[PDB]
Amino acid sequence: MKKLTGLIAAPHTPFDSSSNVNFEEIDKIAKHLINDGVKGIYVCGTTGEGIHCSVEERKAIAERWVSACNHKLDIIVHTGALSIVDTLELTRHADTLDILATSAIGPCFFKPGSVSDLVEYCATIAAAAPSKGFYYYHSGMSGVNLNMEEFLIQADKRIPNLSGLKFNSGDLYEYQRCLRACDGKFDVPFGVDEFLPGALAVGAKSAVGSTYNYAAPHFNSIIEAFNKGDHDAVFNKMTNVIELIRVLVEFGGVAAGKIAMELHDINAGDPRLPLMPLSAEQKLTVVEKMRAANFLKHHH
Amino acid sequence: MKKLTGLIAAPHTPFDSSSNVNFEEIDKIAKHLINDGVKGIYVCGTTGEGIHCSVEERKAIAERWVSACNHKLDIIVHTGALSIVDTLELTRHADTLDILATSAIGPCFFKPGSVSDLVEYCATIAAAAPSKGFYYYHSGMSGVNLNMEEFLIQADKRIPNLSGLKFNSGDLYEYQRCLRACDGKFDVPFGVDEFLPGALAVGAKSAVGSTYNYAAPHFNSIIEAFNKGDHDAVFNKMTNVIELIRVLVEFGGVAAGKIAMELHDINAGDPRLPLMPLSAEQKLTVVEKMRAANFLKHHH
Amino acid sequence: MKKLTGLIAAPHTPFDSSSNVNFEEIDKIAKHLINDGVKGIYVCGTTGEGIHCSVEERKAIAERWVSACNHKLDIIVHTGALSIVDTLELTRHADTLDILATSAIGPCFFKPGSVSDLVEYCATIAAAAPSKGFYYYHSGMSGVNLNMEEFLIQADKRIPNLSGLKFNSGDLYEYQRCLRACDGKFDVPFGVDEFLPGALAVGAKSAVGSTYNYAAPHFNSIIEAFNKGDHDAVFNKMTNVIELIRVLVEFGGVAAGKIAMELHDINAGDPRLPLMPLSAEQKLTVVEKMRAANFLKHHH
Amino acid sequence: MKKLTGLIAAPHTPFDSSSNVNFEEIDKIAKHLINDGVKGIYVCGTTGEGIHCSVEERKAIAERWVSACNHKLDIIVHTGALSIVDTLELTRHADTLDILATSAIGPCFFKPGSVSDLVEYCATIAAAAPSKGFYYYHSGMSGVNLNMEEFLIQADKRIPNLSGLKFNSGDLYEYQRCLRACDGKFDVPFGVDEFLPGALAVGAKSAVGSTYNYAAPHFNSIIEAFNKGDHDAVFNKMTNVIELIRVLVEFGGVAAGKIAMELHDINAGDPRLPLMPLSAEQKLTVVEKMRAANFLKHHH
């Protein structure tokens, strides 16, 4: 298996003014991602509001990404839902698409209470797309707080198509144990963009995140600086990352990140309820503060 | 408006050995509930595993309850889902049925961050079933930890069909503030069965819960004792309730509660993933310990 | 053993304008408590800011209460501190006083990680005052979240002078299991004043709390109403309790409760850092809102 | 001001078999720390069990470190206690010693509820040792979860001897905002040893921690490798760090870390209650697993 490298964007699902999926904007985001140096996409995940879409919408969205990317990006589709019936309907559909892997986030209502229980849930899902890899997505936001090192070690026995897990957590001690589980066999992309050089320094080889939708060249420059050992340059580039994150924290991560796509000529619309929309004034503020953060390049 | 009185069961969704909905067992549970002195049902809620079912299954389940109850019970249908599209499809369907009210539990992934935001989400839902009442279901398990007194006061302005909220929380200080919000206008059924006499004592008039599926006569006897001021009798009856709850805590609330339906000749099957099934040995243990708890009556 | 009955106040430690202990005001509070129908006191606890005082101050405070009460109240002294050396110095001193029992709250920094560990810590403390009873104080605020039923069952074996535990938690399911542990052997006073009728209804015989410092006659009237089965009267009296609690939540429980002592001609001063003082305007507001809550009696 | 550099050990307080302070072992630890390449010490902190010692013991301990270090290490004394009276008695004593700075951890029982409140508490403490620097110690274990960037910005106005804060938290996004607060003015040593290269990569210049008591040469080699950009070497050295941490998690951080001092001929004894002692078998296991982790050097 080849572990992912570089930046994996978790794209938005653009909604038009009637809160319907805007498929033409999905086409424009894919071209943008390819031009800005992203290597893969994780679709219908948290940033993608996949759980805000119906099964029918999710199936059309995953097909739209596969057509829009024209084989130039690795594609991972998140198929998780609270109902195993919906999840299995999405996962079976995903096994028919030209994609790299499926994935499921920890269920957030009845939360798996042990590693063994979580392994059984993931094994049922991964078996419905046995031709594709399978990533567990460890979320924090899910409330599923189980030992991920043990998850990889136990799931290795039970899930034949296991790829590894996406680590959306700041716990670098657990992350480094995951990197080493089963002699380093599994692929463990890191998922906290504002911690990126910290994860690089302890062994991350790829990162999945939402800011890569609009700041990928800037983060690729952090990766290159870190690699060259230019730690001064990593530091000054993270100053612009911290100003970006501040906009997300003030205005909402999905909402502000959607508006930030205007910096690349993309109209991603508002989020869906229960996420709230920004006002017309707030949208102008988001774009002005993202410009002031100074991470944009006038090129690809 | 007439506030609910007495016990409102949150019924299970029985699954057969292929994990499909068992509609004939729904018929048998409804007859049982009516015979055991339940006054209403809250369907497709947490105990009902509504979020484990697809939209199509949920619509068939709600119709099956309305046919099976033959107008003898008040029916509240929980229509909440993580996708507002699914929620609105269920809520519109529910507005066509002969039921009392719809309801939605706090979304557990992106959690409403203020009372105002939660009021906007509930107002969008309640407007899709404007002919029926609407209860918010306050869950704890949802992770949506906002001031429910303020929710009622703010939602009163914004939701014309607001009935009140179901209070699945042990916070009796917040519960009593809810009972009094807007001069006592709203209906606030209590939702923690093992605290029942405590909520009675501070003003509860009805309770919604899962143990009422199989212990309703016993809890109706607590209500009658409390009413008569026989606090000794309340105490000795709660000793049997505590032995019941211990079985739920040891073996899982949905799983053990489903097996307990065998005490009334009902085969409710296993839960769905991510909830795990009990072994054949554990199912025999659940039934023996529920018998030993001594809350069953050999009559209706 | 005779279980405590009625209201046990947790008195404040009055501080003068130099933040020194005001011993003469302790005398005035004791006379007040006896006149207002309190039956016991729990001194140097949370409301008492015992952990804000030095070992030397704490020893003088406990002696001042014993002199001021003139044998008319049962006295429990909280001797807990983060240092076992301080705790044991206080506990040994307390064994020499004419008091009913000592007590310790769960340590809040390194928190006992199992019931067994907590039993060993309490056994070491209770052995330093072997002539007096010993109550564990279960606090929530402590962060020590262990099964208190199991604590009583395990400590029964290990602590010869064990009296029971004071239950400052809203978990009525755990509270009722404590009431029944070892065939109902232990004394378990309830500790959430705004839940009082709820705990009465499930078996509480006494309650320890801070509002009893200034609202004892009103809560004694709730106890009498509940006993007579006058649930309407319990309800209308709890309306005044909820208006009292609102003042505590808005202005701080220790700070506002200290100012409320002005309603009984007592100058309890400000709290100590890290608790902040109220402004002169806020102190006038606290007293006006406590008057408006309408729980005061113009008599004893 | 010169920011700290390199490793700052948080030493243990050795206890003999009567649970008294072993002052002669303090002498031996200081010589060891100086020989193993530590640059400073943070005494009477969490690893030091300072809160388990009385005020009188704490004063003798701080004096013993100052005599034992013979001016070869920078010394920071943690003076925090739950009672401001104890804290101020310790802080005034510390102002008389030849040390670099005092420090206080967030109080864990009544927790400061705003940045402003925490600034007022720290300002009162730092003013009692106005000749020494002052570090706030941000702990997580304290439960004091306030914005530390805002703490530095607000405290800059109010505390004339403010040095900065010790950051015992894995939140690298907050840590990098602290590094930059007030144009990078404050000294912010990092406090999570198992995350060290991650904090290096985002700008840490020093680290305070307990593993530096017995693994300082190994972590100094990580610092040197990271500096040279040898990320392969950082990775393989962190494999030995993860095996060390596993021993702490299995057997208790203070208890196992005390036993690990046997690897340097130091008898640090057991912790004090409420921390539990290891059995004779467990102590042999701790030393065997710390040897197997392979981070020890047969030299200084």
Numbering used by the authors:
A (entry chain A), B (entry chain A), C (entry chain A), D (entry chain A): 1 to 300
What did the authors write?
NAL is a class I aldolase, and its biological role is to cleave Neu5Ac, however, at favorable conditions, the reverse aldol condensation reaction can be utilized in vitro to synthesize Neu5Ac from pyruvate and ManNAc. Despite having less than about 25% sequence identity to the homologous structures of EcNAL, HiNAL, SaNAL and PmNAL, AsNAL shares similarity in the overall fold, being a TIM barrel consisting of a barrel of 7 parallel strands (the eighth strand is distorted) surrounded by 11 helices. Although the sequence identity between AsNAL and the other NALs is low, residues involved in catalysis and substrate binding are well conserved.
The crystals diffracted up to 1.65 Å and belong to the orthorhombic space group I222 with cell parameters of 67 x 86 x 118 Å3. The whole amino acid sequence from residue 1 to 297 could be traced in the electron density maps. The active sites are pointing inwards toward the center of a donut shaped tetramer. This residue points towards the substrate and is positioned closer to the substrate than what is the case for Thr167 from EcNAL, or for an in silico mutation to threonine for AsNAL. Our structure of AsNAL shows that Asn168 is able to form two hydrogen bonds with substrates as ManNAc, Neu5Ac and Neu5Gc.
